[PDB]
Design a protein around this ligand. Structure first.
Ligand SMILES: [Mn+2]
Length: 349
């Protein structure tokens, strides 16, 4: 009993083409896709006004396909999970920094999070690395002046994710840009001949944030897009897989994993606990996180009984199953934060 998981690189707003490719797999092979994982550059523009938040070179200022799905004209055939890249409707993703459905069957994992599906634990890290923004807080509501900085990966996600492999392993981890250094742990020679532009960065190619996270959690798989190429490498127990951009053949691959239990998309318990316990750092809706707080210290307060109560409270107000919610994203921002704050305050601490 195996589950077939589609892994996708950069979409660049080409959804109909991606799904058309995907259905041509379930027929060319007769295999069934359990679900789809996308590693970024989703460009989830709802309508024209969102073009403001899409940082792209001029020739790529396009609406793409997403809005058809947002309108209901098109329907995603597979449950599709994704993180943010460097080309996004960044206002939408900020509204959903704590994750959310952008439309039917399309779930954004947020700035970072861990989810559960079919007995798997999947960790996501959105964005790309620029050193000058790694300590920048998020400002809310989103402003057009932040189009250039919103998609940069913050350092704080390291602390948010670091304890996640304490109780069980991490099956799959996603990022947009590559973990730094991992280019050297594969056939980088074969790569360079095909991508001469990568040679210059050397071992420094990729994100140091993702490097730390990979080393700390050592997932079974690490999947990245962004680099417009196919690539494999091995860092200890972790299989690295890089994917190209939709419209080209290196863009989609498939993971045939053992399916132990079929199980709906669910919030990860440990992630939920971290999410609740770090609330004080995120209590200012205008500017977060507040790094006068230590994410680590806040998370050191996790105890078994506390975790147990959190999961009970989460299950009550929100539910363990991640379900589709068609409320406008600004409502979902406020709503999820309302319940996070409620749960924390009920712990009495
Ligand atoms: Mn990219």
């Amino acid at each position: 009993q195996i589950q077939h998981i589609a892994i996708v690189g950069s979409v660049h707003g080409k959804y109909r083409e991606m799904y058309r490719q995907l259905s041509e797999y379930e027929k060319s092979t007769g295999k069934e896709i359990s679900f789809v994982i996308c590693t970024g550059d989703m460009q989830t523009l709802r309508y024209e006004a969102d073009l403001v938040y899409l940082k792209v070179p001029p020739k790529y200022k396009q609406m793409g396909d997403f809005h058809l799905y947002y309108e209901g004209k098109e329907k995603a055939p597979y449950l599709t999970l994704f993180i943010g890249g460097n080309h996004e409707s960044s206002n939408v993703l900020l509204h959903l920094y704590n994750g959310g459905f952008v439309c039917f069957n399309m779930y954004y994992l947020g700035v970072c999070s861990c989810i559960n599906i079919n007995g798997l634990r999947i960790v996501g890290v959105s964005g790309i690395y620029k050193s000058f923004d790694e300590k920048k807080p998020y400002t809310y509501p989103p402003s057009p002046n932040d189009v250039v900085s919103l998609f940069h990966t913050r350092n704080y996600v390291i602390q948010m994710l670091s304890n996640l492999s304490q109780s069980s392993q991490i099956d799959i981890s996603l990022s947009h840009d590559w973990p730094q250094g991992i280019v050297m742990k594969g056939n980088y020679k074969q790569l360079y001949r095909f991508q001469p532009g990568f040679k210059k960065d050397g071992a420094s190619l990729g994100s140091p944030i993702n490097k730390v996270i990979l080393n700390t959690l050592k997932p079974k798989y690490w999947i990245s897009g962004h680099m417009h190429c196919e690539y494999h490498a091995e860092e200890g127990p972790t299989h690295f897989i890089a994917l190209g951009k939709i419209g080209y053949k290196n863009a989609i691959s498939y993971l045939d994993l053992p399916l132990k239990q079929k199980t709906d998309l669910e919030y990860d318990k440990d992630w939920v606990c971290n999410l609740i316990m770090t609330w004080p750092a995120f209590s200012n809706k205008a500017q977060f996180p507040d790094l006068s707080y230590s994410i680590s210290e806040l998370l050191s307060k996790r105890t078994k009984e506390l975790d147990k109560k959190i999961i009970e409270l989460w299950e009550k107000y929100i539910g363990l199953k991640i379900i589709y919610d068609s409320d406008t994203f600004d409502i979902q921002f406020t709503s999820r934060r309302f319940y996070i704050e409620k749960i924390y305050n009920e712990l009495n601490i």
